[PDB]
Design a protein around this ligand. Structure first.
Ligand code: 70X
Ligand code: NAG
Length: 339
């Protein structure tokens, strides 16, 4: 069922690596900073029942069911094993407010929150924008529940991720539920169908580094991940890519001498009928131009395990350049040049 509602949530851009917006849980609402994540399908926030020996719980907002009159107990154990770490807790139900839409939602109350990486998190929790097929504990995802209300103009949601400005007047980003915002893209959308329903993953035809270097020559996969900071490939693909850039591997990232940064070649991703090109300005964190300083790249290696992986992941690095529309009705992803 389709209505006429379009609901927009303003996002905060933290250092070009974390984009989060606000949701309200319970009666009266308890507010949380959440990542709207196409690479996961569960809603979770830290719990009041999280042992304060998990220091990430001391530094985050915690959900207290004892202060909510609309809370409905569940208690089923929940373990969410992600690429960056694991969170664990139990299932709870309450009313969630997201941009003006109110939905009764089953979510995870996290009681085990590792300091690595969650002490680096500016957000409190996660809003999974993925399909029910990838939902842990077969919990109905928030977007499915919003669709059931039949209030949205379209069975779509869109993401705009801005470049990190130090100006407060700068909008960090924006998620539109039910449509797209023409104020944040130009030209037209070019759609690529999903390999299969259940994953925000498409076929990638090839990856070009300048003129001479070529990767994904026989085709590969691309997961379009709003909850990933960087563009990611397999360890092997990233080794060849970084060799072509003249980048040096560190513990968790890849760097170049800052002065060399503006000289790096364009990287192009062949998706559907179009080539999606990122210049060095798009993937280099140009913090300086010093020959005496190292500059990080917004590209890393991430070996995603099956059935989803092996796959590339197009994270915030990609979405900043290309406004993205996630189309549930048609099982496709649309890209347009962001503005
Ligand atoms: C948000 C995140 C914790 C999680 C739930 C779990 C996870 O491993 N990924 C992939 C993944 C891979 C590599 C890095 C990161 C990262 O640094 N994300 C931070 C972030 C937060 C908000 C927006 C963009 C990026 C995430 C997700 N898609 N969702
Ligand atoms: C938790 O929710 C699921 C939803 O299908 C339900 O089947 C289960 O019985 C619930 N558990 C409890 C103890 O309420």
């Amino acid at each position: 069922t389709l209505g006429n509602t379009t609901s927009s949530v303003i996002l905060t851009n933290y250092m070009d690596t974390q984009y989060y917006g606000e949701i309200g849980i319970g009666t009266p609402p308890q507010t949380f900073k959440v990542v709207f994540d196409t690479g996961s399908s569960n809603v979770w926030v830290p719990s009041s029942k999280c042992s304060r020996l998990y220091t990430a719980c001391v530094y985050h907002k915690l959900f207290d069911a004892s202060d909510s009159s609309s809370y409905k107990h569940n208690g089923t154990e929940l373990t969410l094993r992600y690429s960056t770490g694991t969170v664990s807790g139990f299932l709870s139900q309450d009313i969630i407010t997201v941009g003006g839409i109110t939905v009764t939602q089953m979510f995870g109350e996290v009681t085990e929150m590792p300091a690595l990486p969650f002490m680096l998190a500016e957000f409190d929790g996660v809003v999974g924008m993925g399909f029910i097929e990838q939902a842990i504990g077969r919990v109905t995802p928030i977007f499915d529940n919003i669709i059931s209300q039949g209030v949205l103009k379209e069975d779509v949601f869109s993401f705009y991720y801005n470049r990190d400005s130090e100006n407060s007047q700068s909008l960090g980003g924006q998620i539109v539920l039910g449509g797209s915002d023409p104020q944040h893209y130009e030209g037209n959308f070019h759609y690529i169908n999903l390999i299969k329903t259940g994953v925000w993953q498409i076929q990638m035809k090839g990856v070009s580094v300048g003129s001479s270097t070529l990767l994904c020559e026989d085709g590969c996969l691309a997961l379009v991940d709003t909850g990933a900071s960087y563009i990611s490939g397999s360890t092997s693909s990233i080794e060849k890519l970084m060799e072509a850039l003249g980048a040096k591997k560190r513990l968790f990232d890849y760097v170049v001498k800052c002065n060399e940064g503006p000289t790096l070649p364009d990287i192009s991703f062949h998706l559907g009928g179009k080539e999606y090109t990122l210049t060095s300005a798009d993937y280099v964190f140009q913090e300086s131009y010093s020959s005496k300083k190292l500059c990080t790249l917004a590209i890393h290696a991430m070996d995603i395990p099956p059935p989803t992986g092996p796959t590339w992941a197009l994270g915030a690095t990609f979405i900043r350049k290309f406004y993205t529309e996630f189309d549930r009705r048609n099982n496709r992803i649309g890209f347009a040049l962001a503005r």
